[PDB]
Structure formats: structure tokens, C-alpha cells
Amino acid sequence: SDVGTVIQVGDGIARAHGLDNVMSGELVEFANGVMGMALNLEENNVGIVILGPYTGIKEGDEVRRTGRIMEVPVGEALIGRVVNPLGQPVDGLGPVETTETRPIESRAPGVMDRRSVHEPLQTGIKAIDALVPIGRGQRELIIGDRQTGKTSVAIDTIINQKDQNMISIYVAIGQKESTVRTVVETLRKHGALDYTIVVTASASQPAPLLFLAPYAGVAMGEYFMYKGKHVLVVYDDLSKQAAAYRELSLLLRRPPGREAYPGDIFYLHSRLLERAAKLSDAKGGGSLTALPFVETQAGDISAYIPTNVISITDGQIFLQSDLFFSGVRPAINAGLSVSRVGGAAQIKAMKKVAGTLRLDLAAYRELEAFAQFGSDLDKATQAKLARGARTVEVLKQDLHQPIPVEKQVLIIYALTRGFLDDIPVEDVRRFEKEFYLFLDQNGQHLLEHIRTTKDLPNEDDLNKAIEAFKKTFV
Amino acid sequence: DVGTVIQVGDGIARAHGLDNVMSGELVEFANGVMGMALNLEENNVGIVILGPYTGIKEGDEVRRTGRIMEVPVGEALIGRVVNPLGQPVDGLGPVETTETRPIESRAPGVMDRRSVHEPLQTGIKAIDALVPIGRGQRELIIGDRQTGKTSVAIDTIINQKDQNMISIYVAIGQKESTVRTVVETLRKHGALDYTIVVTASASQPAPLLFLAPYAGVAMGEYFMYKGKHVLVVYDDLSKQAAAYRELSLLLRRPPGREAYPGDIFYLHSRLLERAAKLSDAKGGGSLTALPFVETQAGDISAYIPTNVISITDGQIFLQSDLFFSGVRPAINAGLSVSRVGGAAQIKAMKKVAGTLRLDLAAYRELEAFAQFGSDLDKATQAKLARGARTVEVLKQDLHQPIPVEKQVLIIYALTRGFLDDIPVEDVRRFEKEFYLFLDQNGQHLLEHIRTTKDLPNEDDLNKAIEAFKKTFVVS
Amino acid sequence: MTRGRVIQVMGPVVDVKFENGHLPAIYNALKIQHKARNENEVDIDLTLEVALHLGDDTVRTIAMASTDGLIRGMEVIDTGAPISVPVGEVTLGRVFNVLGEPIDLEGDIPADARRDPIHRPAPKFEELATEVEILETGIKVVDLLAPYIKGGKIGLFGGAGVGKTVLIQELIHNIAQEHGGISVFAGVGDRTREGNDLYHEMKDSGVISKTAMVFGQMNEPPGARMRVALTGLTMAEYFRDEQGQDVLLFIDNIFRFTQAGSEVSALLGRMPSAVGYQPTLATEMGQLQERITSTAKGSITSIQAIYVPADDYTDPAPATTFSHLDATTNLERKLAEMGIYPAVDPLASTSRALAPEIVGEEHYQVARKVQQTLQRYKELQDIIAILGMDELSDEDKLVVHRARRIQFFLSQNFHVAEQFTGQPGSYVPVKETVRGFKEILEGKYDHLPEDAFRLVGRIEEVVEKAKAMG
Amino acid sequence: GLTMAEYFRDEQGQDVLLFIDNIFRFTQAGSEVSALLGRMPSAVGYQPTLATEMGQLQERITSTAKGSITSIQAIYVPADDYTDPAPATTFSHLDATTNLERKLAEMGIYPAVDPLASTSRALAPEIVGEEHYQVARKVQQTLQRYKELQDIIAILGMDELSDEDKLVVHRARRIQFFLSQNFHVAEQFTGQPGSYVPVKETVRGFKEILEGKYDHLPEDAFRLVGRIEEVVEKAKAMGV
Amino acid sequence: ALAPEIVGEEHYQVARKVQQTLQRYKELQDIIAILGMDELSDEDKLVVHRARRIQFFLSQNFHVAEQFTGQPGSYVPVKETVRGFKEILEGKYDHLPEDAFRLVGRIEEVVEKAKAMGV
Amino acid sequence: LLDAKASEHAARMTAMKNATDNANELIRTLTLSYNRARQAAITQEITEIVAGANAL
Ligand SMILES: Nc1ncnc2c1ncn2[C@@H]1O[C@H](COP(=O)(O)OP(=O)(O)OP(=O)(O)O)[C@@H](O)[C@H]1O
Ligand SMILES: Nc1ncnc2c1ncn2[C@@H]1O[C@H](COP(=O)(O)OP(=O)(O)OP(=O)(O)O)[C@@H](O)[C@H]1O
Ligand SMILES: Nc1ncnc2c1ncn2[C@@H]1O[C@H](COP(=O)(O)OP(=O)(O)O)[C@@H](O)[C@H]1O
Ligand SMILES: [Mg+2]
Ligand SMILES: [Mg+2]
Ligand SMILES: [Mg+2]
């Protein structure tokens, strides 16, 4: 029948006897009102994961079948609210008042139902827009050690999308509840909360809800994607999801692997990260795009969960601790950051300027790793080294201040074409600022064209404007 | 004596009954596929399936053969391609054997053995001169991938035509195309008329690979106790170790270093210690074995490599950088040794070349120092000149063995210094020409070494080598 | 007839009980197709592969699609046979999943198609071929400096953005055009953004008409991902067994076949071996590679990409895979940046056919010299990087000259390149490249502008292309 | 301890301090009882529920709208391995962290605090001021440059290098020793009585070291001293 | 049995001084692996010369080695072994080359083995 | 002085060539020790895990 009884209770796992018609993945309801999901079905024992406080469930208490597969509430009313992984409001402010539901175990968009990533996501970070392009419908990994910039890089991305016709979701997994509150008040101050959803899974909660938290977040975004608006999703640690599945499995007594991890780990992460796509014109041209985060201990890029997330994505941004403690900020290592969907997600103007820089930074990393100290080497080697330092000062940027794309292409045009040779390395950070002021007051004509035609204006006019400013600068 | 299968998974089954079954017995399923009984728990016998396991299902009818693991032996096996079980593979019909032997024989005990007093001439200049092997020895060929391992063994079997030896080749874990190819290569050189090739290629269940080396020695011991000398080659003992770990970790036996079940040493020794030189009371027979082990990173120092370096009476280490530097066969003199060697050389060869193995290691270091070195002295420069010629005198070509009387004559030239006059590239051609000249002109020297295993009068030999050097021309 | 019923479910694993004791064999396949009785239920259309006979008339099974939504007691039926996919001319120009269903919206393959098993006993020693033969690919660098072999396993190690997809497509075109043989592409664990781009490029390059493709996605449970290589294989077996033509099989990354095997060994409850890998690594790897053989009728040759797990070639996945490989082709980015396509590094690529018994003596001498010439130039490159060209000794200049021409004559104009460029392209027979490189190494053609050798075919083309400049 | 502090925070409403000594010994106890409770093992012999227990305890130790708990903890790094699960799981809960290193304790630089691996959410240009932040990050560049340069010195030798590299090693030695201090609880361990340095003074002094004003003094004078004034006198006794 | 009373003070002082030279050269070995002996100065140079002498003078010719190498064996009584090390440690045999110190029994044998070379 | 300065510059250049060649050889020898240690650490942790799991 549809009623069973609990026999073992412990650590957020219970075991039931009966409940013969249950499905794998169902929702089940205990007497206390706490809900649960069936993940195992042996011949005499049904295995239950509890999705709530398990200090009131006693042995012999009843458990009853809902009849629904696991479902997350969706609707326009969720925008601007702080919510649980289950559709339950947390900020106070009353009910969420949703209209309908979606499964959290959706199938991904197939081949023949997808298109090719062809449009940009302007992050407003000089290094991320120029050097490591993310295009709508890609999966981008931010992988790095603790204390290197990470939440800083995602928060800058949401703000710099204010003008653009975008929807953004933040999925905070395993984080201390005062830290989630610091990001939210911060977003209310920048006016960001009006078009965003924060989904929260604090460190006090049963592991199972941390596991569902990334799935609930994509299940909310896919509703808007199939309706046609573009959407962006950030997961605040996939390594903290991977820990909570291992705990649930080892209490369900399933067999171990490399580091106590269940044999499903590639299947769990892949099912979540392939629900990112650019749908085609028949599907209405919507798009998800995804930003998983992974934290690596002593930079072990070879660990089990890190080897796995470096593979499923369409690129990586590896961040290094020594660059940070050396003034390079954001601390993005150019050698280990690659985008395999690169070359299509930039505006036409930026593609021409960005190509030279990748070659320029490389010819410095090789030369500098040996010759910075040598007082005099060949005249070329001096030329490459000098533009090498200026490039690493043009890529430096401040916290919580994104830069619009037209200004990025202009500063990168000037460094690449040699206008910035005369300027010393220390004042490159100020020549930048003075140039932005001069461009606004005087050069309105050049900025008009790049935004509208994504294209670069006539060289003589650009050379004239930049050469004239070089006269003004002191 | 009847039981019933309860689990049939991964190549190991279990069966309920078979009351009088002896341990080690061959077991027949209802299907007619074979198996080995290895364990007897109180209600259940534990069976290893020695064949494809996808036709056996719970409910089948395993039956008892009545015989301990037994391999078929007889003279009819020579010249046939066979399975580890006595089953013909080449086509060509039945093997038509007469009798059987256990695959779990005891090794000839102490007081049933003797010391080695006859050579196993390989026709390879570096192995015969520097690292000698005699009948009854156990010698390890160690190296990395693509270094020359199969090439050294096959050169040995062809050259063991002239001498009255039986040779067995046991291919463990090898790709099937490489094996079919070796049989056609042996048929072309006429070798198959006196040999047996035993095959356990990679698509088969791991039990017939594990038994494959024990069937090969079981065929060779029949001939050994009847008095005729025998040689056995094992094509990968490190692939035998891998298949034993897989069978053990499926029976839930606890692991160890790497994941190797501790019974790796016992496995390898049980096989290698049946090689023996029987004494005159036993009729003076001999086995000899040349096991092969592959090593990761071309590093001598690792678990399975060191374990077989323990059971043998020497080792021949082959190096990958020597192989890519034109030295073929690629033999490291410093790390390669023979422990029963010193008695296994003919008298002329002991006198000619015993200080070559140690002196040649000294050149290897002094060359390495000299390249980075700026200015050398006269006694270092003279040593550097002889070392280069020795390395070119030890270079050979594939499938071309050199008779032992011709070996001692070319080595006499180098050690006594006649080859010092000739520029280096010419050394290989000087060696082909001297062998032709010996054939056409110098027959008296070649008659003396064969009968007395002994070197002729020094005046006559010095005369002859000067006479050849007049006829030779340069560049 | 008879039927089973489901008695346990855990992730990808399921157990079925067959009460009469009439049970399925170890690699047979089972269907669940069920219509929902009440609105609480979810309709299901799953299939399962057998793995172990546990006892008590029960069988352990791995699942090929998502197992979410399964009720205990749900009925289940046995097909009497392994997974079987359609073979013949029907499967050319189409895309299919592991089961054999068509993923393309190009109709459905009919019932009458002959369907043959994924799992089959391997080829025998009375059936193979005694003498090695060399396969002429029409590509200059590959045929000269790392000859491919009929019945061989070739390995591609290269970085992203070096021409992999172009080299695969040109090989498929040359074999179909000149040697008259089809190809198969089996993508083991591939990202669904790459499958779409590949189908569009295979169609827009015109190559599609001669190839059949199997895609197994990353989002599938491990068993489906593992057996995707075994269906691409069984399709190429019909073309060698019956049509008798030679066939080519491409595998997207062999590492994910080994990873899927590890993940299935963990679900099934087996004890891990060294570096946490399955206890049956070389019996799995061998049972794939030992079907890629040159039988008397015809041959299968395979180009397989491999990922080095940590930049460690001493690991148990590289160890077992490199045991089977006969040639290794490595693609370099520096060459690509400079303008050389195909971008294959002459000095890091190997073959076991480059020995004078197989290739013949003229080919061996010509090849070794090319390697000797290029390596010496790599040395003078750091001297020329620090100081001036005049500084080199005269003999050293006579090696700089030949190396620059040799490096360029390796470059070739492909036919699939005409979508990325505006020139027709050429195929070179092995005798013509061996003759030509002998002329360059004797210096007969040194009175020539350097760029005359760029993206050209036979050596006589250089003569005419020179005249074009003047 | 926490229930007592909670009553003082919530009902009385006074602000409160909590000192917890070795919170690792809480995590370690769970392991001992895990096997006898019937739990399967995880990672490096740890409980299958490590994050869950650390979260329950730590998420109670907070400063609410009613009142504030400042909480100060010692955390034990289980086998000198900061990559262990118990410390890694702990780093996610703090607002400010100092990591102590045995290599510094061997050199005798007490307190032995890693100036790079230690971090706080209060080192932000508006939370501490522009003058403070400038000096702080500039010290962190000097000490990261000294770390890479020590490898080159150890094999090739110090005289081989440039004037800018020499001046980095000069200043980095002084900065690293001037981070050491004479405490009142080190009265028992070192004889000397002890010092309290106000924040304004610390910024002045570290700025002088970076600008090179005090580079004439010998380096041993900077060890176990509190204010920069003292360092001048300590040198006088030596005779400089 | 290495204690002043058991061995005598002369043997004890000789054994400890030999073990001190060998430990210094197991630390110098990390720098001479890369640069060679140009980096070494003063005491480093003298210590490496004497360590090379000591390490080869601990090697011997055995009667059981006759089945492997044609040389005869040697038995060195204890009073002789101590005397040789002291002359090596003092520096009385600094002039003789390192290849003359290998596979010998007593210090007299090193002098005749050097004289055969003439180096 | 002409000969002295010329000979000093050449002496540093070979000393540097040999020093670099010794360093690169040490890097391959050390790299292999790291990979052998890394693979042993991953086979110990999995055997302790499975030893406890088999007991319970
Ligand atoms: N671009 C930047 N410029 C200056 N300071 C920065 C920049 N990005 C980050 N920071 C600073 O460095 C630290 C970055 O902390 P952040 O939370 O971004 O890193 P995290 O990796 O999320 O940390 P955790 O591992 O604790 O989650 C903070 O002190 C922050 O103010
Ligand atoms: N002396 C030689 N002269 C020339 N070529 C040789 C010589 N010895 C071997 N070769 C060739 O070099 C290659 C060596 O392959 P071989 O099978 O002998 O090595 P292996 O170590 O057994 O290889 P694997 O590890 O693949 O089993 C073959 O091409 C062989 O023919
Ligand atoms: N043979 C060639 N001729 C001309 N251009 C080529 C050739 N091969 C590659 N390219 C250029 O380099 C690109 C490499 O793309 P592709 O091979 O798909 O990269 P990947 O190796 O990542 O699959 C081509 O799209 C084209 O721009
Ligand atoms: Mg964070
Ligand atoms: Mg071989
Ligand atoms: Mg590709």
C-alpha cells in the first residue's frame, strides 16, 4: 500500500519497511511534516534521505507516499527573494507565491536542439573580457586556492550585466550565513537584487539539502531559458556539493572509491553541467550559461573532483596565490586559462586587438622567467620586456568597479600600437584614468560608433585622438 | 561427487556438491567448458573457469573429470601450435599425445642437482662474451617497451638448431598478430621442426594466462627427465603477475605493496625453481629458463622487477637510450651480471674476453666525464680509443647469429689491439670481411677451436691476422 | 513465454528475480516498457545489461539510461541476446546512440535491418595475416616519417586548436576516394556542444556520405558510456567480414572508456587495484583492441586519442593502452602558428614500421636523414636566436637552408581545406614523396625561393609554382 | 560554554567574549566513537559526517541584532598538514585567520605567524584607511619576493644577484625580524618584561623600514622588540 | 662494541673522526650534484679529497670473490686497519691517486698499486 | 687583458652549459620519485578505506 514505517533513524538517513509502490526519486512525507526522497529500494527495506531536522523522527513512526517526483517551484514571483533549496522563503517577507513546478532531474538539450555559442557575456573585467572569453551557452570553471579572488569575480559579473537584457542566479552552497548576507546587502546597495535570485544552503543544514541546492538553482533558470530570455547561473562551491553526496552515500553503506567518493560523481556533476546550452531558433533562441567554482588544496589540479570538473567545462580560469601577493589583481594566470569556444563571443572590434596581446604576454613570460635581471640584452629583448611590464599593469583592475566594453577596446588598442611606450610603468595605472576622462569630454564620436556597429572607426581619426592626448599628458 | 553453481560472476564460480572432489582437480561443467577447483568451503566448492565464462549460468551441471590438473605430453606435440590445455589451435587436427603430467610438480631436490659445465651459445656477441649463460641457469631479460626483448630470444632459438636442444616459446599476454607472425618467421628459418609454441593472448579469461607458464615447463620437464636438454622462454612474467592480482582481488584476498597479493614471490618461484641441471645419476639432463620482466620508466628499482631479480642466477638489463643511440642489442654492462657464469664459457673464450665486462663499464663513465671534460691525459685518451671499437664490435644485425669460433677470433683482434689501426665506421665491414676470409683462406684456425675448445699457437694466429690486414683496404 | 520482476534499485544498479529459474546469460539485454496505471506513476522505457548471477535466482544489472522513477515489482523482459545494432549500407550518413536508435531526425531504420551483437568472440589465429602491409594515407608527413600499418592502432596526442578535426576528415576522404573504404566515428563520453559542431562540419565538408557515427554523451550512466566503443566496432566488423573492404575506426578519447570501467567496478562492489583502477583493466582493454585486426579478407585500422592522466606515462591507464599502439603522432602548436598544416611534429612521432624490413632500404635511409637534418637545426635555432645569421659557419648554413625547405615540403594542400581557403588540394603516393625528398636531400632543387615549398604536393609542382612568382 | 554565552548575549544583552581552546579535539572525538556507533569510514580515517557537525556547532557562534559575541579559537592542524579535512572544513567559517608555522618557530621569530597565509575581511581600503592598506600590501610584495629569491641564493649564492635583488633581501630580513615581539606571558620564557604597541605607531615604523631610513642599523637589533624607538637604543648597546 | 674501554682510545678516536668526515661529505653532495667543485672553498675542498680516499680504502679483495674476479684475497688484522686510516686522516698519503685505493687490503698495497700506474 | 677577458667569458659559458644540463637531469630523476610517491599514497588511502568497509 502507500504507508510504511521507519525502522532505522540516524544522521539524516532513515530506513523504512513497506511503501511498496514507491518510485526511485519520489517525495515521501513523515508525520512530523518533514519531507524525504527515496534513493534505494531493496527487497525488504526502502532507503530514505531526510530533507529537514531529524530530531523528531522516532522508530515506528509512519511515513506516507506523496505521488510526485522531486519538484522545485518556479515563477516570476521568486525574483528578488531569498529562498531555500526547497521552495520555502527565508528572508522573511512572507510567501514566494509561485504558480507551477519543474522536475530537478530534467534531461539536457540534445544535439539537433542546440546551436553554436555566437554572442558575448561582457563581464567588465579587463582580463576576463579580452583574454578568456565566455560566450552565452558555455560552461566556464573558476578553479583556485582559498583567498584568491573568486566571489569577487562573480559579483563583478552580475553588476556589469545591469544594462544588458539578462537574468542572473546565485547558488550559495555550504557558506557561513553572515557571508551570504554580506553579498545580498551588497547587491541591494548596487541595485542588483531587482533582477536576481539567491538560493541558499548554509553549513548547518543536512547534507542532502546542499546536494539538491545546485540542481534547484538550474531548475529555476531552465524555466526562463525555454521561455526565451537569456540566463546566467553561479555555483559557489561544487566541492562542497561533492562532500555532501559522499556523506549521504557512506551512511547509505554504498561502496567507496578513490577518496570515499561514490562511483556516481562524474554522473552527478555531468547531469547538472550539461543542462547549460544555447538553444536554437526553433526553441526560441534562449540560453543558459554556467559558472561552477572548485577549490583546490595546495593547487592539486590532479585530485579526483578537480580532474572531473576541468573536463566537463568548455574552458578554465585558474587563479594563483603568488600573483595575488604580488599586486596582480585579479590574479589570473594566462598560461593555464584556456577557452575552447573562444573567438566568437567577442565584438568584432575586440577580436583584432585581443589577438596581439596573447602573443605579447607569452613572449614576456618566457623571456622574463630568465632575463628580467640582465641589465642589457639585445635591443629587441629590451623592447619585448618593456611592453611586457606595461601589459601586466593594463590588465590590473580594482574591486567592485566594472568597465564597459568600448573603453576596454580603446585602452587595449593604445598599448598594442605603441602609444603607451613613452609613459613609465608606475603611471600606466593613471595614464589609464586620465585617458578615460579625456575620452568622455572630447571623444564622443569615436565611442558612438563602437557601441552601435561593434566595429572600429577609421585609423586616421583614432591615431589623431590618441596622439593629441599624448600631447596633453604630463 | 555432484554440486550446483550458485554464483557465476567475473570468471570465478561456486558450486554446491561435488563431495569427493580433490583440490586441483579439473572440473567439467554441463556445458563441456573446463575449470580448476582451488577452494573447498564446508558446503561450497570454489571453481575457476578456464575458458569463456559467458555460456555458464546458475543451474548448470558441473561434473567431476577424476584427474588432477594434468597437461598432455608426448613427442607428437613438437611442431604444433597448442593451447595451455592440451588442445590444438593451428588447425591441422589432433595433437595425438600419449600420457600426462601434473602442472604442480616438485622441483628436483638438493642431491639431485649438479653445477653448470656446458655452454648455451646464443650467437650474440655481447651476451656470449660479457654475460654468459650455461645449461641449467635461470636468466632474466629486463627492460622497457621496444628495447629488443623478443628479438634476443628468437635469435637464440634459430642458433639452437645445430646443437641437439628442444626449445619452447611461451607467449603470455601478447597481441595475437605478433604471435602468428613469429610462427611464420620460425617456419621460414626452418626452426619449427624442433619447437613448441604455447599461446595465451590477451582476449582470454585470466586463468588460462596464469596456467600458461606452468603448462610450458610441464611439457619441457618430460624431455628433461628423459635426458635431452631443453630451453624455455616466458614472454611476460609481469603480465602473469597482473592476472594473478585480478583473480585474487576478485576472491577478496587482502592487498599489499602496489595491490599485489603477497603470493607473487611464491608464484614466480614455484615456476623458476623447476629449472635444473640434473646429475649423472638422473641421466644428466637440463632445463634452462629465460624469464622476461618489463619495467616502468626504464628504472631497475620496482616491486615485480626486484622480485624476479631475486629468483634468477643473473640479469641482462636493456636500455632505451642506448637503443635510440645506435647500440643494438642495447645492453648496459654495469647492471647486467651472471652468477653461475664463469664455468659456462669454452676455454678459448675464458682466456680471450673475461676482463671485457668489467673493463667496458669503466669506458661508459669515462666517456660521460670526457664529453663535459675539457683536457684529457694520454692514459685516458688511449682507453677512450679502445672503448669506441668495442661498442662497434658488439653491434650486431637482426636474425644473423655468429658461430662461436668466429666470435673468439674477432674478440682476439680487439683485445690484442690489431683493430686499433682501422677507422671506426669501417669496423662493421672489417668484421664481415674477416669472417669471409676465415671461410675462404683460414680454415686451419677454425678447425682447432671447435675440437679442443682451445686457442691455437700465438705465432700462427698473429701471422694470420697481419696477413688479413695487408689485404684489407680503408675508406 | 517468461518474465522477470524488479526487486532492488540503487542509482545505476538494478536487480531482477526470475522465479522459474530460467535465467539470462551474462551480457544479455533486458527491456522495461511500462504505461502508468495511476497519476502518481511515471511512464518508463528503460533498458538494462546483465552483469552477475548473485544467487537465489537473482541477477545484477547495469542501466543504460536514467533509472529515476522505478517501482519495485515492475515487470521486465529478456531479448535472448546481447545488445544488437543494425549493419549494412543503411547505417551510412546517420547518427545513433549506444542502443542503435537513430538520434538524427532522419526517420527510423526499419525492422528488416540485419542486427548483430555488440559482444562477440574475438578473431582466431587461423584467420589472421602473416605479412605486414603499409597503408598509404596520401599525407606526406605521416607516410614518410611515421608510416601507418594495416591492422594497427595509432595514437593521437595533441593540444586543442591544432587541426585534429581537419586531419580526421582528410583521412576519411582519402581512404574513401582512393582505397575505397568507409569510416566510423565513435565518440566515447563527448560534450554535447562538440557533437553538434561535428555533425554540421561533417555535413558541410561533404564527408558525411562515407561515414557512420555513434555518440555516447557525458550525461549517460557509466555502462552506456563504456559500451559505445563496442557498437562502433561491431558496425565496422560487417564491412570487413562481408563487403571485404578495408575500414577505419576513430575513437574520441580512450581514457573515458577506462574511467567508465572504474565507475562500474565501484557500483558492482569489486575491490580496487593500483591507483584506484578496476581489478580487470587489461582484460577490458585487450577485449576491445584484439578485434582491431587485419584478417585475410580485409583490415580495420584505428586512430585513437589518449589523455595522459597527470602528465605521468607510468600510470596504469597509459601503461595498458601503450602496450597495444603501433604508431604515435604528436601535433605541435608552434608549427601551427607558423603556418604548417598538417601540424605534426616530425621528431616526437614514432612508428614500428620504420625499420628496413617493412619499409625497404631506400625509404629508411631517406627518413633517417630527414630526422638528422631537422634535429641539428633545432640546436642552431638557439644560437641564431641569441646572435646573427652571418656568425654561423658555412657548413652550418648548408644545414639551415635544407632544413627550412624540408620543413615546408612537409606541409600539404588538403582537399577538406577548401572551406577554410581557396585552393584545390592534392594526394601524394608514397613513391612520389620518397623520390621527391631524395631530390631535396641531394640538393637538386636548391635554386628556389623558400615559400615555393609552402602547401604543395609533388616536387614538380614546386617547379611550376616557382615560375608563377617569376 | 556556548549555552552560557548565548544566555548573556540574548536575554541580558551585554556584549560577550568566547575563548575556545583546541576545537580540533571536538572533531577528533567523533572519529573515536564513529566505528563503535556502526558508521563506515571516510577519507583519512574520519567520520562520514564531519562538515555536518562542524556546521551545527559553528553556526550558533554569531553576533545577532540583539548582541555581539567575539569568538577567539585555537585550531590544531592534525599532522602539520593544512590540506587535511578537519582544517580545510574549518577555514570556511572564520572572518580572520592567523596560521602559525614551525619553520619560523625554528628560526626563533616569535610570534611565528605567516604574513602571507594570514588574512582578514577588515583589510579593505575603507575599513582600515588608505595609508594602512598601502603599507600592508607593500610588505606582502617584499616577503613574497624574498621567498622565490631564497631558492636562487641557496644554490648559486647571494653575491651573484642585482642591486634591486640585494635591496629586497636587505629589507625583507629586517621586516621579518621586526614582526617578532616581547609579550608579558613571555616574561617567563625570555626574561625581558614586555610591550604594547598602538596601531598608529606600527604604521609609522613599518613605513620607515620600507623607505630605508633605518637600514644602517644591524639586523640582530630588530628581534623581540616592541616599538621602533627601542630598536635604536638596543643597537646603541651593541656599539653601533 | 664501539666504546673507549672495549676498543681502546686510539681505535675510538680514529673511528669517530672517520664518521665525522663522511657526514660532512653527505651534505656537500647536494651542492656538488649541480655546480661541481668550483663553488666549494677552503675546508670543503680538503674534506672532499680525504672523503674520496676513505670511501675507496674501505673496499677489500675477498677469497670468495675469486670465482668472479681473478685477483687473490686479503685478510687485514685490526691493528693494521686502524693504522692505515690514521695516515689517511693525517694527510700523509695526499699525493697518491684515487684509483690506487680500490680493492686492496693494507696501506703498503696502495703504495705498490700507485707505483704500477706511476700517476 | 684581451686574452684574459675572452677566456673568462668562455669559461662561464661552458660552466653554465654543464650546470644547466646537470639541473635538467636532476629534474627528470626527481619527477619520477614524485610520481611513484603520488601513486603509493592513492593505493594506501584506498586500502585503509576498504579494510574498514570489509570489517563493517
Ligand atoms: N580584484 C581585487 N582587487 C583587490 N582586492 C581583491 C580583489 N579580488 C579580491 N580581493 C580581496 O581579496 C580577498 C578575496 O576574497 P574572496 O572572497 O573574493 O575570495 P574567495 O576565494 O571567495 O575566498 P574564500 O576561499 O574564503 O571563499 C578579499 O580580501 C578581497 O577584498
Ligand atoms: N639488433 C637489431 N637490429 C635492428 N633492429 C632490431 C634489432 N633488435 C630489434 N630490432 C627491431 O627493433 C624493434 C624491437 O622490437 P622487439 O619486439 O624486439 O622489442 P620488445 O622489447 O620485445 O618489444 P615490446 O615491448 O613491444 O614487446 C623491432 O622493430 C625489431 O625488429
Ligand atoms: N589543413 C588546414 N589548412 C588550413 N587551415 C587549417 C588546416 N587545419 C586547420 N586549419 C585551421 O585551424 C583550425 C583548427 O580547427 P580544429 O581543427 O577544429 O581545432 P581542434 O584541433 O580543436 O579540433 C581550422 O578551423 C582552420 O582555421
Ligand atoms: Mg567565497
Ligand atoms: Mg616482444
Ligand atoms: Mg575536435
Numbering used by the authors:
A (entry chain A): 26 to 499
B (entry chain B): 27 to 501
C (entry chain E): 1 to 470
D (entry chain D): 232 to 471
E (entry chain F): 353 to 471
F (entry chain G): 232 to 287
What do the authors of the reporting publication say about this deposited model?
F1Fo ATP synthase is a biological rotary motor that utilizes a rotary catalytic mechanism to couple proton translocation across a membrane with the synthesis of adenosine triphosphate (ATP) from inorganic phosphate (Pi) and adenosine diphosphate (ADP). The F1-ATPase consists of three α-, three β-, and a single γ-subunit, with the α- and β-subunits arranged in an alternating manner (αβαβαβ) to form a hexameric ring with the γ-subunit at its center. Moreover, the β-subunit is the principal catalytic subunit that undergoes conformational changes and, as they change sequentially, they drive the rotation of the γ-subunit during ATP hydrolysis.
Moreover, imaging the same reaction, at 28 °C, would produce a structure of the enzyme but in the catalytic dwell, which could be used as a direct comparison to understand the molecular basis of rotation in the F1-ATPase. The predominant cryo-EM structure of TF1(βE190D) obtained when frozen from 28 °C was almost identical to the bMF1 ground-state crystal structure; two of the β-subunits were in a closed conformation and bound to MgATP (akin to βTP and βDP of bMF1), whereas the third β-subunit was in an open conformation (akin to βE or βDP of bMF1). The structure of TF1 obtained when frozen from 28 °C likely corresponds to a “hydrolysis-waiting” state where the enzyme is paused just prior to hydrolysis, representing the motor in the catalytic-dwell state. Although the structure was highly similar to the crystal structure of bMF1 in the ground state, one clear difference was the βE nucleotide occupancy. In the crystal structure of bMF1 in ground state, the βE site was empty and did not contain any nucleotide, whereas the equivalent site in the cryo-EM structure of TF1 contained MgADP. An obvious alternative explanation is that the ADP observed in the β320∘ represents ADP re-binding from solution, with ADP being generated by the enzyme up until it is frozen. The hydrolysis stroke occurs after the catalytic dwell; MgATP is hydrolyzed to MgADP + Pi in the β200∘C site, resulting in its opening to a half-open state so that the γ-subunit is pulled towards the β200∘C site and pivots around the β80∘C subunit with a 44° rotation, MgADP and Pi are exchanged for MgATP in the β320∘O site, which reorients to a half-closed state primed for the ATP-binding stroke.
